[PDB]
Structure formats: C-alpha cells, structure tokens
Subunit: 331 residues, 4 copies
C-alpha cells in the first residue's frame, strides 16, 4: 500500500462528466480577464483553456491552478487540441487580432473570420450542445460568422455586443447624476463600435423618464450636452487603448455577467448581438445588439424596444453598415 492507499479508502472510481463546464478560447488579455472573472463568480466546475501559443497557454493554466486553494472550480485544464473542451455548456471565443491605436474594429474582419473557420467547427465537434459566446472583434460580424459556420440554432450563438457599451453608458450617467450605475438605467444598442445607438427615450432613474423631464436630452440643442456621454462610450476603447494598449477588465466583467445569466438560467435582459431580422422593418440576416432574455438555452426572447424615429433611423444605419460587411463574407 502506498501512502494514498493507507490514507484513503476508495468507494468508487468512475469518471463523471462536469456539470457546468466553461471553455475560453484565446488566453490573451481578454480571455484571461474572462477566466478570472468567471472563476471568482463560481460559475463553473471545470474551466478549459485553448490557444495556439502552447507555452503561453500552459503558463496561464498553471498560474490559475496555483490559485486553486482560493477558488471553487476544482478542475482547470488546457490544450491546443479541442478534446480538452469536450462537454462544455458555454464556450467563450476571445481569440484573434485586436485594434491598434486608431484602427477600426471593422479592419479585423479578414484575420478573425479566417481564425473562426478553424475554431468554430472544432468547438462544435466537441460540444455540440453548448452555447457560444463570441467576444472577438468585430463582435457583431463574428457572431453572424459563428452562427453560419456552427450550424447552431441562433438562440445558442450570442455576441457580447453592447452589454459593455451599456455598462459604460450607465457608469457615465451615474457619474453625472451622483447615483450608482445599478440605479441608472439606459441602453446602448446596435453595433459594438462607432455606429452604436443611445436610447435616450428609455433612460430613467427610479422609473422617471429623463427625456420627459428634459425634452432636449441627447439633441444638439441640449445645454447639458448629454450626447457627449454617448460620444464618450464610442471613444472609450480608443482612449483606453491609447493609454494602456488594449482593454481587458471591463469586458471580462461584462462576459462574466452574461455567463452568470446563461449558466444560472436567470432570464435577465442584456443587450447582446443577435439576429434582428423582423424588427424595425429590417429584412437582412444582420446581427447587432438588442435587449434579449438570456438563460440556459441562450437567447429565448428579444425585447421589442420602442424607439423614436431618430433612434430607429440610427439603429437602421448601424444595421446597414454591418450588413454591408456581413453580406460580402465568403464561407
């Protein structure tokens, strides 16, 4: 008898699948922020990591494993081979090229589509019943791409979308009003990018319409220049990229928020990238953010947000910009 044998009597040796497995693909700044945020929210019983850079992948995995004492996720694995990802409930894709200073997210398309052509079939092979959560940019276009390549029903292909833009908007609104963002309500929809749409008509604190109180809210005639709040949301990534090189923490928290709703079947509403065909007269298979009910089967329902004529025109412009790109892609 070995020490382990003398210490421990085994009742059964059976391999059971994990109950709540999450995979993150891409262990860069974003993937590792999503990983740590998910670990510290106790959302998974197994975390798997995938990348193409083998040394970085192993190092990241080890660094998280060394923290196991402080976590409640008892198995952390990694590998370049997608067999490590099998039986995942949720697969989060963060791999690919990121924006350089002054580059648009839309300049990343070719690079990141060609990565997805390899990643997505491999994910689907090993977790045919997972939900896919796309983070890689440009996130709305890549959500469309992941949906086309996977063959999944569209409820199971979810882009992180404007959950982050809306969190930024609420932070900025809170700063102006002296209220925690949790109590400042306001939605940013459409592209996660330059063409996003602030929904001024829905902004409120305690159910009190700010546009009703201040009819010029968001317009050029506004003495308080609330449009600058949305301009700051749009410019956020560019400033943070200029200062620190990339963004990571806010998106990691945003993704963990989405993962919480999916994994715990909460049926919370989040603005995430999905197919908008049938809303606002849009006929095209365009993906962009609208508020969606999220839970264990992904997106089960879309909220039909009432938009002003100007808000609706701006959303349709965002859809046109994205569809212009999405329609020319080759599969």
């Amino acid at each position: 008898a070995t020490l382990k044998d003398q210490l421990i009597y085994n009742l059964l040796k059976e391999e059971q699948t994990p109950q709540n497995k999450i995979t993150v693909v891409g262990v860069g700044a974003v993937g590792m922020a999503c990983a740590i945020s998910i670990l510290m929210k106790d959302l998974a019983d197994e975390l798997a990591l995938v990348d193409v850079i083998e040394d970085k992948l192993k190092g990241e995995m080890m660094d998280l494993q060394h923290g196991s004492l402080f976590l409640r996720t008892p198995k952390i694995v990694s590998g370049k081979d997608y067999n490590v990802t099998a039986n995942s409930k949720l697969v989060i894709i963060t791999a690919g090229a990121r924006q350089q200073e002054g580059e648009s997210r839309l300049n990343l398309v070719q690079r990141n589509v060609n990565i997805f052509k390899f990643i997505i079939p491999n994910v689907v092979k090993y977790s045919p019943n997972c939900k896919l959560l796309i983070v890689s940019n440009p996130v709305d276009i890549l959500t469309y791409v992941a949906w086309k390549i996977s063959g999944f029903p569209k409820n199971r292909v979810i882009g992180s979308g404007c959950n982050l833009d809306s969190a930024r908007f609420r932070y900025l609104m809170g700063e102006r009003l002296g209220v925690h963002p949790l109590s400042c309500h306001g939605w940013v929809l459409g592209e996660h990018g330059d063409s996003s749409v602030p929904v001024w008509s829905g902004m409120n604190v305690a159910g009190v319409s700010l546009k009703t109180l201040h009819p010029d809210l968001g317009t050029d005639k506004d003495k308080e220049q609330w449009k600058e709040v949305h301009k700051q949301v749009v410019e956020s990534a560019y400033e943070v990229i200029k200062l620190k090189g990339y963004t990571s923490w806010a998106i990691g928290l945003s993704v963990a928020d989405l993962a919480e709703s999916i994994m715990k079947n909460l049926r919370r509403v989040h603005p995430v990238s999905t197919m908008i065909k049938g809303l606002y007269g849009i006929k095209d298979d365009v993906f962009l953010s609208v508020p969606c009910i999220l839970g264990q089967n992904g997106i089960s329902d879309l909220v039909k947000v009432t938009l002003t004529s100007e808000e609706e025109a701006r959303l349709k412009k965002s859809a046109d910009t994205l569809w212009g790109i999405q329609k020319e892609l080759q599969f």
Copy 2:
C-alpha cells in the same frame, strides 16, 4: 435647474472612506491584486498609484467601466499620493521583476514615506521582490511597528504546496493541509510534520515523507513549489493570477478582522535562534491590526538550521543596503 436638480432633491453635502485599499504599482501583479480585491467586495474605495501616468489612467478607466458589475463605488488613481489618503491597507507591488535589489530599494525610498504621509496608521502589505528583504526595508523606512508591516512571503508558496498535494491525493486543496515557511521562493522550508488530511499526519503514516529515501519522492512536491514558479515565468513571462488571489486572501483577513492564520513574512528576531533583524514567513494571526500573534511551530533541527541559514543570507544582503 439642471436635469440632476430636477430629478434629485439633495439632503446632505465631506466623506472619509471607511474601508479603503491602495495598490501601488499597476503591473501584472498589482492589477491581479486589484481585480481580485474588487471581486471579493473588500473595499469601499480602491486607489491605484504608479509612475507611468498613461498606463495608470488606462487601468483605472478600464476598472471604472466595469463599475456596474462591482460593489466598490469609488476607484481613483494618480501619481500623487494624496489619492491614497486614509487607506486601511496599502499593498506594494511596484518593482522590477545586488544591483537589482538596490534598484527596488531605491523605489521603496520614494514610495514608503509618501504612503506613510497620507495613511500613517495603515497596514503595509509588501509583495515586491525580493519580498523578505523589501519587507525589512519597508519596516525600516516607515518606522511602523512590526504588526503593521507584512510581507506576502510564503502564503503563495503554501497555496502552491496545497494544490500539488491535492493533485497527488485527489482531494481539494482546502482539505490538504501543509505549511511552507521561511523565505519565499528557492530557499523555502516544507514542514513535513504538519502535512495532513483530516488531522492524520502523513509523516506518521509514511515516516520517509520528505526524505531522500522516500519511494514516493514526496520531496518533489516541494521541489515543484519552487520550480513551478520559474516554469510559469519561462512560459508566460511573469506570474500574476495566483499571487493576486493570495494577496486578496490576506486582504480579506485583515479587512474583516478574521484572525485567520497565514504564512506571511514577519520580523522574526528572537525566534528559532534567529538573532538578526530579518523577516521570514511563519504562521501569523491576521486581523485589523495586522499581525497580532504568531504560531510557534515545532521545528526539527534541520528545519531550524535552514531558517537560520536563511536569516544569515538575508542579513548579509541587508547590511550592504544603502537607504
């Protein structure tokens, strides 16, 4: 009236934060400490300091953008230490990662008096390496009592040990007990007599535990505590996540006055035949006043000699330092 005044009636107009933490140095380690402390709801105000102003602002903004998802309502930063005023706990992660030691000492000469100016009754938690030496340097420069100067020390080494023990036994690390003491890193000491599951001494069950003759080579578990760190540095360039979690665990005990026991670096002159002013890790009771008490572990002759060799080594270096 502004929209704000139309919406909101003000009852009350100066607040002192009540549970504030500062992190100095927003590199990989300082930001891992920051996110971990944020996600554990330990502070009502988090301040960040660095000398690289753009990096600092960018890190601050990135955290602020996640405020909706957190319960820490104020995140601030600056190169000026006024931003750190009234911190309960100041965590120093600034550095490079004998000339190199002196360069981190040179950074401490600027950092420590600035911290003390703005938070004279904080607890100082030193993470920067070489951590046992820099904890001594921070103690000397600050003039703080020994209870309020704590090195992260072997808390991380012990967490690695417990992970690796758990992997061998098929038990979660929480239920695998074992202590790594002394110097952080290469010269640490695994206390084999204390390694246990459910109070069952593994050394009593398997008396060759830890020795050269052990058929199962349990000494490799300690070798891997040392070597797995260097492996992570080779593979990814640095370590960050585990130290960040370790630090947040220490912060939790201090902020919440838990009186949990952790192997952190403390001024140990007067124990184990140690006769110089050096900091080594021993199990310490941590709470709101820092280290209030420590556990006197019974050590073998060999273990005591290893701590004494470490103290001689540390002291050798410290007597050469200029500050």
Copy 3:
C-alpha cells in the same frame, strides 16, 4: 506555561473597536432573518443582538456562533444591556408589539412608542453616530417616532418602508412576463402595506414603459387586470401571515439589501420611508416611501418622481392620516 502560550506568541494586546458593526434589536422571526441574511452577505465584522427575552436571545446568539466556521463575521454578541451594541454603524429595529383583535391603530402605535422610549435612548447612548433602520410596524409612523426620540438628523433615520412591497411587485411582474425580477422595474411608494401606491408610469422592461404600450394598464378598463399585481402586493403578505403565521424571509433579504447599500456606501436607490414634508404638497412631519439614495450617511438625496393627480392625492391622504395619529402621541 498554558497550551495557548506554548502555541502562540502574542505581539500586542491593543483593544480594538469594531469597524463595520451592525446591531439587530428584536430577535423574533424578522430580526433573525435580518441577522442571517446580513451574516451570509459578509456586511459586518461584529453583529450584536438585543431583546428583552433573555433565554431566547442567548439561544439565538449561540446557534449563530455555532455556525461561525461558515461565516466571515468574527464576533457575534448579545445581551439585554445595550453595552453590547456600542459603536454600531447601523442599528436595525425589529422590536415592538403586534396589534391585538379590536385594538385601535392609535392605541397600538402608542404601545410601540412606549417600547421605543426604552430602546432608542439606549441605542443613542452607545452608538451616537449610527444609522437607524426601523422595520417594526406600523413602519412609517415608527420611523417618525424613532426620529423624534433619537434627535438624529433626517438622513440617519430610515424606515424599511416599501422596499419589500417593491420587491414583491417586481416578483409578481416577473412571473407575468417570464423575466427575472432584476430586469422587471417598477416602484411601489407611499405607505407600506395596505395603502401603498403602484407607480404604473415607471413600470418597464429595458426602458420600455408598459403603460405606454397598454394605456389601460392599472385601470378598471384593463382586460389583463394588471391592477391585480398591486392587489397581490398587498394581499400576498396577509396570505403568508395566514399560512405560516408571520413573514420573515423576504423582509430579511430586503433589509440585508438596504444594509449592503449603507455599509458599502453604494448610492443605490431604494424606496424607503423618509421625512417627506415639503414634497407633493405635504405640510406635516410625516415619513413615507420615495426612492432614496442610500450610502454611508444614510439617505443623502431623494428622487422626485412625477406622480399623477390620483397618485399625489393618495400620498397626501396618507400624510393626513399619519399626521392625525402622530399629533395624538405622547412622548
């Protein structure tokens, strides 16, 4: 010599003040549900319990202490003497007497005044700078009573008010819509319980006003009978009391949420009872629920909700009734 001294070397014996202390006065079902909820949210470093029933008090304290391994609140104390409450940041009052069959509201309030004349000066002696959170019913009147006796400024005397009523409303809204209550917004204001006011204009999902979509919402013309949601906010409480004898779990959760905002200085908005003289054409020193910003100094600000004529008349009628009782009280 002792085993303790052989094992542990003491560095300093300095006497410590707790930094984040909470007291609960009254350890009936409601006080204990508050206690457990606060304990399981890691809001306090010390929890003190007070009651007049000495055996019950000690037994509750001990039972909680036996669970210490599972908690992160290192000191739990109790006693009939208020010295155990010293230096509390937050003092929660759940003590009082329950209405008897055939007892007038004035008589019942006067009995609770008498009990508060015992409790409140002793709280103030030991925690002169605490925030007081009054849960005891009738809560809006007893918040006024606590304010008068304590001598505290308005910002530091808070009634739990309609925070529970609103949480019930959001549950019931969520059940009808198939959406988590976190994503169902709506506010019940005014008097806790029977006379509360559902603010239909603020009821929304994702900023979309239900009343705008369905103008008959809340009226007798409504074929979907949404008024029944508010009827059930009132009646479901009576129903729980009929079925189990009292209510406890929900109020405990709601109080812990208030305590979280106060203890962490969040500046979240909650519908709690505050002195409302000077709003809505109210002229008397009465306390009613409006959305208030809660943080480390208690209520720092309040939201001025736009009310319909009927809603405003209901608040004024409540103010009249409450003042009519208050003017007859003997302090």
Copy 4:
C-alpha cells in the same frame, strides 16, 4: 396583442442543478435560506405534509427572489415537484410527545421515512440523499435500506455539525478563527461522539504533542470540557430557544456546496462503515469523507487509539441492536 406579446418576441418555447428539501420546519427552512444565499441551485423544491405552512414558506422565499439568483422555487405535498433533483435533503421529523419512549420516537421517524423515501426515489432515482433528521445515523441506514441506493449516494449529516461546534469552541479558547482551528469529532452524532485529540492542531502543530495530558482527566486545562460542550451547548440551545436551526442550516449548505460543485472536500459525515475499525455490522457512523458530484467517493482512514476504536465499535454494536428492533 397581449401586453407580453407586444413587449417580447419569443424565439423558443429541465433544471440543471436542482435541490429538494423535505420537511420545512426550522431546520429545513434554515437549510433552504442558506442554500439560496450561496447560489447552489437553479431550482429549489420544498415538500411537507402540512400544506398551509409549506405554501406560506414557499411564498415568503419567492417574495425575496429579487435578492436571489435561484429563478424557480416550488412546493407541494406531491413529489412530482421534486422530479430530477440532484440532491434531496431530508429534514422531516416527528414531534416529541410527552411520555413516549426513545425507541417509540425512533420508530415514528422510521415510519415517516417509509413514506418519504420511496416517493423521493420515484421522482429522482439518480439523486444524492442527504439525511439530517435524527436519530441521524439510524435514519441514514434506514434511507439506504429503503432506497436501494449505493452507499456513495446516501449521506448522513452525522458529526458535521458537531465538528463545526468543536472548532468554534477551540477557536474561542485559542483566540483564532475556527477556519484555522482543526479538529475532528467522529462516530455518532450527539452524546456518544468521539473527539480525535491526536488530530487537533493549528498550522499543523499538534496540540496533543505540545500538551500530552490533552483530553485526559489529568489535564489542568480540562480540554475534555471542549468536547463535552459540543453536545451540551446543543442541548442548551434547545433549552433556550426550543430547537436548533442556524448552525445546522449553514453546515448543510456547506455539504451541499461540496456536492453540487464537485469540490472533493473532506467532511465528517455518516456513511456505511462496515469493514472499518473491526466493525462487522451494517451501520452508519461519521468518518472524514470526500464529497463531490457522486456523493461520497472516498473516505479517510483516520488512525485511532485502541480506546477510540473501542468507542466506535461500541457505537456500532448499539446501533445494530436498535436497527434489529425497528420495523420497516
């Protein structure tokens, strides 16, 4: 045309982490709130035979849903509400009656289990059963026999609470958080439990080695009183408030955490111990067990003194003797 359909466009018309609590007295409801506040389940079902109390408890929890992350709370007297539970916690018990014998009370609780357990098995044939109801070691045996489950799937709370109390009391003597005070109470829950003095330690420092009289009658510091206070403090709580609830509920939630999250942490829980310590009969006693998604997968073989082994053997003899007298 309905408001719901004007607001929401539907794309799609079982729970994955469901827990049931059977018996909604103070213990059951303390287990429930603790499990809810730890986000361990996506669905919680409650069962009792007292229909009004059951419905009221359910409603009161539902009213707190805004503050929780468990989106479905259900109840009923019919076990269809318990279907597809991962973990079923039994906190049901008979009310003590003035003048009844101990053996009579045990048999009445056995009769309750005869109704409950087959109903649990019908609707969640693949669950883990966690038995809290007293006498816990006997009733865990009973549930194992009636259910026909393999032993890894029938777990008694056992000495889990006793050990928590012990660590609390040790922490109070030493001025250290109970998290950092280690020590195990094994065997039977309650009066006949066994304090394992050899395992008592802080930071891996054996208190027995420092203080060889520890736990004996010779001991000037009377550390034996720490163990006596474990059961005496329990009975004191019952005298004072009428029952115990919060510590049990927290300790049960900790067990549920290890099982639901597959943690493989070690807890002293009651398990079928025949074949250890020279025990020859089908009895359940508490030893340190590794808990995860398959229940008890492994257990720790604590080295005991001759005197400690003889205590466990005497407990086994006692339990088997009672189990023969029970009808089920």
